[PDB]
């Protein structure tokens, strides 16, 4: 059966703290952060806990990143974890995309996604077998499974907030243990966009029209002289 001494840990070799963004000395007393109405549909609000989580990982926007997980027995590092695993959001946000959408990953059996209902070693049957009666209704449906022999990652959004990734080891041949963990990342983006429907070309043509109006106004300035 399961071996109870095993556990999974996500590395935090450099954290967002101990520099000019956030300090560890302040977060534990209700340092609560904001959700900009992007999880499901209003005024959502998230409470980070330092004692449960600590100083979260730091990542940047539009960077192909995967978490690297280690297997621990009796509190001892022994081997990094290599099997297929999935991530999810407890808050329920969708503001992050995935890598290559299972087509270049050579999937062939219509891979199931985060819409079938909780994923674990029981419910999961892979898409790299040769199951015969559901080949594809799939040009480019994404591949919500990381690790393993594929090389797909998460591209991050521009929300500029903290994420609580609920990670589950998924392969049913690594162990009988339902290996599950919860870890925290924080994105640091570049620039939000508030340009709306006025485009750069639209403002350009507005400026050209205004400048031609100024020229047509300054023509009588020469005419009267």
């Amino acid at each position: 059966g399961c071996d109870m001494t095993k556990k999974i840990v996500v590395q935090n070799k450099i954290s967002a703290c101990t520099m000019g963004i956030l300090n560890p000395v302040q977060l534990q007393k209700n340092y609560t952060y904001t959700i900009e109405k992007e999880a499901y549909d209003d005024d959502l609000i998230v409470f980070y806990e330092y004692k449960d989580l600590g100083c979260p990982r730091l990542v940047y926007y539009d960077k192909p990143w995967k978490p690297v997980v280690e297997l621990w027995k009796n509190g001892i590092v022994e081997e990094i974890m290599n099997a297929e695993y999935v991530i999810s959001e407890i808050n329920g946000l969708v503001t992050y995309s995935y890598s290559l959408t299972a087509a270049t990953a050579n999937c062939r059996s219509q891979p199931q996604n985060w819409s079938t209902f909780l994923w674990n070693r029981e419910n999961y049957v892979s898409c790299h077998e040769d199951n015969k009666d559901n080949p594809l209704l799939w040009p480019n449906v994404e591949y919500q499974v990381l690790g393993g022999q594929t090389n797909n990652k998460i591209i991050f959004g521009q929300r500029n907030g903290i994420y609580t990734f609920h990670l589950s080891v998924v392969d049913p041949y690594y162990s009988y243990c339902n290996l599950n963990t919860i870890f925290s990342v924080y994105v640091h983006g570049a620039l939000p966009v508030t340009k709306f429907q006025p485009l750069l070309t639209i403002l350009l043509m507005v400026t050209t029209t205004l400048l031609t109006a100024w020229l047509a106004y300054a023509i009588p300035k020469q005419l009267r002289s």
Binding site: P24, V25, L27, Q28, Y50, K51, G54
Partner: protein
């Protein structure tokens, strides 16, 4: 006027510990003998017990397997009669000073 080898860091203490000054302010009127001891010890290497405080203050939980030495101001000459007490909660049944 006394300090030691090292600071709160460079000793592996992930979180905030308790120092002599902190425990003296913790105990308002009781004498210095009952201020600290094995009945009130909590480790610095905790991540779950006391505090994520600032790191860099002088560290006095000195022991073996640590190099922690004592230090006095260089200028004036004086004497400081110290009594040494073991802080471990589960070493022996009695008081050893």
């Amino acid at each position: 006027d006394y300090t030691f080898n090292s600071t709160m860091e460079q000793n592996g203490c992930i979180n905030e510990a308790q120092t002599w000054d902190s425990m003296i302010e913790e105990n308002p009127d009781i004498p210095l003998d009952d201020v600290w001891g094995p009945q009130n010890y909590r480790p610095c290497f905790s991540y779950a017990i006391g505090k994520p405080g600032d790191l860099g203050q002088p560290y006095e939980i000195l022991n073996y397997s640590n190099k922690n030495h004592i230090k006095w101001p260089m200028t004036y000459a004086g004497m400081y009669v110290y009594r040494l007490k073991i802080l471990d909660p589960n070493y022996s049944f009695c008081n050893l000073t």
